[PDB]
Amino acid sequence: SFSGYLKLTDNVYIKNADIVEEAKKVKPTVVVNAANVYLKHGGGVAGALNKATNNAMQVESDDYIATNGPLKVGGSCVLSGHNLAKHCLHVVGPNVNKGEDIQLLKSAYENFNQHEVLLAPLLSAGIFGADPIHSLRVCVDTVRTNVYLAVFDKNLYDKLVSSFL
Numbered sequence: 001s002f003s004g005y006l007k008l009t010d011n012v013y014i015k016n017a018d019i020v021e022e023a024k025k026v027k028p029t030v031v032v033n034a035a036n037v038y039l040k041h042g043g044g045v046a047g048a049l050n051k052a053t054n055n056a057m058q059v060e061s062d063d064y065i066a067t068n069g070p071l072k073v074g075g076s077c078v079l080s081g082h083n084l085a086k087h088c089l090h091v092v093g094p095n096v097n098k099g100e101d102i103q104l105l106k107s108a109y110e111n112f113n114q115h116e117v118l119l120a121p122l123l124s125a126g127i128f129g130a131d132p133i134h135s136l137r138v139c140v141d142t143v144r145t146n147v148y149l150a151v152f153d154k155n156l157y158d159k160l161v162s163s164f165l
């Protein structure tokens, strides 16, 4: 199972790790992708997870979008986890760089409550433009299921742990 995580709360754990390497090692039941409404996995966590699946995640995602249309900001869908996990929960956090409502971050984290345990990144962090300290606070105050957060950036991981209230 998950190793080397720092316990933040009853159900939230955090580690300085590459979520792709973490997924290949643990092969969790659920890996969360930092998705956009189009499931276009170009960069950030989505681009990295997709590249690890040899683009199978993108092929599956394009078929999902062709059938269902785009997701809502704050919404999610469950697709295959390919070689990374049993399932991938594609969650759309607000992209503040695209001028999206930061209040939608709590709705985005609520999707995690449908899964008993997840390997996840901080939603709306990185290229999505939100403050990762705020994302961690929303995560701990919203998610009730067991969430193992992988933070790629060491300096950000240290800042998150050292400033955690």
Ligand SMILES: NCCn1ccccc1=O
Residues within 6 Å of the ligand: 018, 019, 020, 043, 044, 045, 048, 152
């Ligand atoms: N080897 C994947 C590294 N990584 C982790 C998180 C987000 C983007 C990214 O490229």
